[PDB]
Amino acid sequence: ITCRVPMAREPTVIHGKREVTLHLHPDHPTLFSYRTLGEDPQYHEEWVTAAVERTIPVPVDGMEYHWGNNDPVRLWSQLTTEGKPHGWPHQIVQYYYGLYPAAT
Amino acid sequence: YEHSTVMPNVVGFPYKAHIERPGYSPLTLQMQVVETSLEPTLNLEYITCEYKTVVPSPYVKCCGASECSTKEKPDYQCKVYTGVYPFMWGGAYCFCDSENTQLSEAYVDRSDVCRHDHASAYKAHTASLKAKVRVMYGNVNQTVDVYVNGDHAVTIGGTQFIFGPLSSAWTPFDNKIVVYKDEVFNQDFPPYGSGQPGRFGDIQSRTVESNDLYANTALKLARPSPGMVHVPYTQTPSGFKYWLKEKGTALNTKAPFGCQIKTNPVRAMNCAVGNIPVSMNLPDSAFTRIVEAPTIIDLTCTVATCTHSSDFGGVLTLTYKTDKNGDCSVHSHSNVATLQEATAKVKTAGKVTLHFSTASASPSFVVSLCSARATCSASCEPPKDHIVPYAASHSNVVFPDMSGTALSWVQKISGGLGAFAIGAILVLVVVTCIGLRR
Amino acid sequence: QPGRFGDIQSRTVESNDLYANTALKLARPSPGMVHVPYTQTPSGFKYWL
Numbered sequence: 001i002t003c004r005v006p007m008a009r010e011p012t013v014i015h016g017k018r019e020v021t022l023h024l025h026p027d028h029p030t031l032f033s034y035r036t037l038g039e040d041p042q043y044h045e046e047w048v049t050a051a052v053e054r055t056i057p058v059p060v061d062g063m064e065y066h067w068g069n070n071d072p073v074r075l076w077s078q079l080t081t082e083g084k085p086h087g088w089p090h091q092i093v094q095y096y097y098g099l100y101p102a103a104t
Numbered sequence: 105y106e107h108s109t110v111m112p113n114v115v116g117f118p119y120k121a122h123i124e125r126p127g128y129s130p131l132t133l134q135m136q137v138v139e140t141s142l143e144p145t146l147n148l149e150y151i152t153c154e155y156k157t158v159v160p161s162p163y164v165k166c167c168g169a170s171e172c173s174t175k176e177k178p179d180y181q182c183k184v185y186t187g188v189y190p191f192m193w194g195g196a197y198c199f200c201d202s203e204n205t206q207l208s209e210a211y212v213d214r215s216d217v218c219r220h221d222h223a224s225a226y227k228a229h230t231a232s233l234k235a236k237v238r239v240m241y242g243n244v245n246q247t248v249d250v251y252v253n254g255d256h257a258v259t260i261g262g263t264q265f266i267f268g269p270l271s272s273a274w275t276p277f278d279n280k281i282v283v284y285k286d287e288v289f290n291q292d293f294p295p296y297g298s299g300q301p302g303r304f305g306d307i308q309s310r311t312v313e314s315n316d317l318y319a320n321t322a323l324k325l326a327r328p329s330p331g332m333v334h335v336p337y338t339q340t341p342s343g344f345k346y347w348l349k350e351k352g353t354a355l356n357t358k359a360p361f362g363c364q365i366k367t368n369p370v371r372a373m374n375c376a377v378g379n380i381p382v383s384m385n386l387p388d389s390a391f392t393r394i395v396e397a398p399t400i401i402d403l404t405c406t407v408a409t410c411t412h413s414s415d416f417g418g419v420l421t422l423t424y425k426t427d428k429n430g431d432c433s434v435h436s437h438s439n440v441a442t443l444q445e446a447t448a449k450v451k452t453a454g455k456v457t458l459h460f461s462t463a464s465a466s467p468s469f470v471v472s473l474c475s476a477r478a479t480c481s482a483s484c485e486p487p488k489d490h491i492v493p494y495a496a497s498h499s500n501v502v503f504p505d506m507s508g509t510a511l512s513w514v515q516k517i518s519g520g521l522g523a524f525a526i527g528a529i530l531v532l533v534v535v536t537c538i539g540l541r542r
Numbered sequence: 543q544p545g546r547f548g549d550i551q552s553r554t555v556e557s558n559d560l561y562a563n564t565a566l567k568l569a570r571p572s573p574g575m576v577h578v579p580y581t582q583t584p585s586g587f588k589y590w591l
């Protein structure tokens with residue numbers, strides 16, 4: 001038969017540099033999972049009981065998270081940094097280092 | 105006419121394909137991939153479900169003896185015990201104080217319900233791919249389903265399309281998989297006839313309708329307690345429930361490349377990897393003569409704004425001189441930047457505007473409008489928003505053009521140093537030659 | 543901010559002005575029913591308590 005189940009509360013999202021912070025306020029023990037859409041995924045899943053905060057990395061490829069019984073939500077990160085990419089040479093190198101550290 | 109090209113296997117990424125032949129106006133094709141499904145070929149090995157234990161009523165013989173013979177039945181276990189004194193509510197059961205024998209036996213059979221609830225074991229082979237592609241050009245806009253294997257061919261508007269084969273042969277399923285309800289698990293399972301008690305595979309069957317069954321559950325009987333009628337037995341619990349309790353992490357939350365796993369039939373959808381080569385054969389009715397198409401002369405390009413972001417964060421303006429108003433096909437001849445629209449309208453005014461997306465700091469690309477071409481170079485700045493909810497709409501290129509500010513600086517530094525080095529070499533050569541003259 | 547300390551504030555105990563931020567989003571009712579659904583972050587005062 002067809003069997004009725006509630007939908008979890010929507011979490012609170014705060015952005016950041018290659019990171020997101022999620023405030024989760026559950027009413028029942030709920031399953032929370034997340035993964036990255038890259039070559040080697042950093043999959044994770046856990047049971048949440050009380051109100052909590054979590055930090056999730058979002059690479060330039062993408063992240064997908066599943067909370068409660070809602071549809072999975074996907075996020076992507078743009079190429080953002082500090083420094084002018086058309087100024088003095090030290091600003092050039094600092095901006096490029098902000099993009100990729102090791103290569104620069 | 106015949107043509108061939110390659111497209112990226114990313115769902116939702118637009119592709120502009122430029123086809124030009126002498127004597128006919130250039131054409132632009134819009135190709136998109138809406139969904140892709142990868143399904144492997146399976147060979148069923150066995151199924152597993154919960155079991156049940158049948159223990160019939162024990163046999164009691166007063167002033168006598170009994171012996172039991174073996175039977176062909178899964179994990180049949182029989183025993184006979186002597187010196188028993190059964191009791192019930194009415195009182196004693198037999199005259200003989202110590203000449204009574206109790207015959208007990210038990211066996212195991214599959215659950216009457218596990219037809220609905222069972223887990224299957226499969227071996228995975230080479231997988232075939234099918235896809236859904238949307239094609240746009242002129243007054244034609246249609247979505248068709250194709251097999252990406254290099255054999256299937258489709259016809260749209262008198263045009264033949266052939267897709268595949270895929271460049272990289274990569275599959276997420278390993279050799280052995282286990283399927284339950286709507287989840288798949290990439291785990292190794294014991295071969296048939298070698299199951300172990302308490303773990304996955306306690307009971308086995310070739311198929312759901314099989315009349316045979318192989319079970320190993322360590323059915324051990326024991327002597328009944330004095331003055332009672334019952335058949336004690338100890339047996340390890342069902343391994344199917346144990347596996348259900350700590351199966352692990354399903355492939356749905358672990359599969360790489362962000363592609364989704366579905367069952368009935370088992371498949372992986374939207375697996376973004378590799379590139380798809382497409383071949384095409386076109387008729388002569390889809391082109392237009394040079395005489396009918398407008399003529400564009402003295403084309404120059406200037407950029408207005410550039411901010412390399414996921415969306416189309418770049419706008420530029422194109423100036424031209426024409427002879428009659430009409431429609432032209434606009435294309436970007438380099439992978440560094442991607443255009444949004446493929447067909448533009450040209451009038452006597454001579455000004456048009458275009459939107460494009462890029463990733464490099466200082467892009468440089470050739471833009472073609474009808475039969476004319478021009479070059480564009482731009483200076484761009486990074487965006488400020490950190491996280492956005494739409495996928496990237498540009499190919500990831502980062503290396504700047506040789507005319508960029510940073511590359512100009514390094515070129516000037518290297519040029520000065522090289523000139524100084526050449527001067528040193530010339531000075532030393534002149535000095536040593538003058539010294540050798542004497 | 544919703545969900546933390548001070549989701550609703552009043553300048554005094556008898557003020558008539560109030561500032562609230564709790565993300566009161568609505569939703570479509572299920573077919574063949576009479577009700578009003580809404581999703582709201584729990585009170586942050588209890589969380590702080």
Ligand SMILES: *[C@@H]1O[C@H](CO)[C@@H](O[C@@H]2O[C@H](CO)[C@@H](O)[C@H](O)[C@H]2NC(C)=O)[C@H](O)[C@H]1NC(C)=O
Binds near residue numbers: 167168199200203
């Ligand atoms: C009635 O009970 C008597 C016991 O008094 C049973 O006689 C026994 O029979 C067995 C079987 O040959 C012998 O081994 C015992 O030694 C006998 N006991 C005695 C005391 O003689 C008799 O079999 C019972 N009859 C029925 C029909 O159950």
Ligand SMILES: *[C@@H]1O[C@H](CO)[C@@H](O)[C@H](O)[C@H]1NC(C)=O
Binds near residue numbers: 245
């Ligand atoms: C092509 O057809 C589809 C299906 O109706 C439609 O959604 C899409 O907007 C069409 N494209 C254009 C450019 O009209």
